[PDB]
Amino acid sequence: ISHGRVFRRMGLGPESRIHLLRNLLTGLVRHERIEAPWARVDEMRGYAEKLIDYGKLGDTNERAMRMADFWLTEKDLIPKLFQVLAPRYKDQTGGYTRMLQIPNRSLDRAKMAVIEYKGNCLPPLPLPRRDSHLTLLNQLLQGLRQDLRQSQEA
Amino acid sequence: ISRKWEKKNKIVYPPQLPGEPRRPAEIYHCRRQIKYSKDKMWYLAKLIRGMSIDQALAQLEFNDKKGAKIIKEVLLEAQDMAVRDHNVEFRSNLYIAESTSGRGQCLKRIRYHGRGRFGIMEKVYCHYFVKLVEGPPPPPEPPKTAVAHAKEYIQQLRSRTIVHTL
């Protein structure tokens, strides 16, 4: 029974799980786009979002610096977090990362995901795009919406 | 060993008379000594039976099994061969007439057991056979209807004879 068990069991145990996520998070901050097994990227995505929130507290904040020190193994990333990533998202209240499933990797056919920090310099990922408004179904719904405006106005 | 499948493409038919309906082209292709078990390969060969060449390629492309890539290459080779050497017009106008796996020539290796017993492990190989036929996929036979069932049952009653008498 695993009712309400939010966290996955990974690696060699609890401590190993955090270190596995920390290594993935450290790679994401440096590269801004990494690809790994889907479950691990999904497990790490929450920490990636929360790390940006600590970066918004500022480097002067002692608790935030302690968080960045632990979660960022490579210390040169800590300045990047507070001075690059955090200011980038100053306006946004969330949704810092986007996660997309990519084809299963050849060796073990593991389900794979790509996760990136929105706004990176890297070439854009081929995001899924909703159908054009000009399509037949959308045009029929656009006409319906316009009529409901006239009826509402009356 | 036997290699009859390769020779089937060498059959030459007499020129058809104008009245005769155009005979659909048939392409036979296979890959020998694949490093895979025929048992595992059978499911992949079964899956694409009766599919169009494009539908079979699509299903195999997103199949995780190792055999799927091998069969997909054989299918692409057969499709290219059909148009180039067998005078098939449209490459898409092909369907999987026959798709089967066959036991290859296997290698026996000395293996070991946890208590020191001596064992023979076989390194399994298999063959994949495909036959492509020109034209659209034959429609799947529909389900037997209630009307068909009733007709069959009444036919059985009508075929009854007085048994063991003059």
């Binding site: - | 493409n9 059959i11 030459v12 020129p15 058809q16 005979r23 659909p24 082209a25 048939e26 005078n87």
Partner: protein, 236 residues
């Protein structure tokens, strides 16, 4: 790798030192690779139906060499002889009479004639000869290895032929079974003058650029565009 250089480059990269072989025996060739002096068919020849003297003189020099090996040779008889060889060779295609075909055509011609039709059915017939065939050119090679001297005679043939090629399944893929069509062909004939058993055999055909495009094929064809890797971008 198919090329020999790549094979020997792979062999030196594999340490497979292949020593060469010297023997008294060598491959015995009954024909040559190509035409000794290509005969450019004058443009407009089909339309009709000092340089000429110089070219004719070369044929007169060559015809003497042919007479030396075989004295009882008449260039006047060859057009009729060549016509018969041409018709017999093509008739062998109808019934895949390869052993007979080998006597009528050289080892250079044989692959071209029969390779493509290995699994096809060919129906060919010589309906008529529109104008008499005449020997346009006569050439003769210089002394080659093994003392082999070859003589090549080019004959211009304007004839009416019928060709229908069926595929491996009996379905018509080219031509019409009975409709006669007009064909102008320049056919080079070769003979090993040194060989005591050499005979005049069809060697090759000459295709001038002005030649009209051949009959269109029945089926449609798709010429695929560049198959590009993900990084490579298509460029018009």
């Amino acid at each position: 790798f198919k090329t020999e250089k790549e094979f020997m480059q792979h062999a030196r990269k594999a340490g497979l030192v292949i020593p060469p072989e010297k023997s008294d025996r060598s491959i015995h060739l009954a024909c040559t690779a190509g035409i000794f002096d290509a005969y450019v068919p004058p443009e407009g020849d089909a339309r009709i139906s000092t340089e000429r003297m110089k070219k004719t003189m070369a044929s007169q020099v060559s015809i003497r060499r042919i007479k030396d090996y075989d004295a009882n040779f008449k260039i006047k008889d060859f057009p009729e002889k060549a016509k018969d060889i041409f018709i017999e060779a093509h008739l062998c295609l109808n019934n895949s009479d390869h052993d007979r075909l080998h006597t009528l055509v050289t080892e250079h011609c044989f692959p071209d004639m029969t390779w493509d039709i290995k699994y096809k059915t060919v129906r060919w017939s010589f309906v008529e000869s529109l104008e008499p065939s005449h020997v346009v050119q006569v050439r003769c090679s210089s002394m080659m290895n093994q003392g082999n001297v070859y003589g090549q005679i080019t004959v211009r043939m304007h004839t009416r032929q019928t060709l229908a090629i069926y595929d491996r399944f009996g379905r018509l893929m080219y031509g019409q079974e009975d409709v006669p069509k007009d064909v102008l062909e320049y056919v080079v004939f070769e003979k090993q003058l040194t060989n005591p058993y050499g005979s005049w055999r069809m060697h090759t055909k000459i295709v001038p650029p002005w030649a009209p495009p051949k009959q269109p094929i029945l089926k449609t064809v798709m010429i695929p565009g560049p198959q590009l890797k993900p990084e490579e971008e298509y460029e018009e």
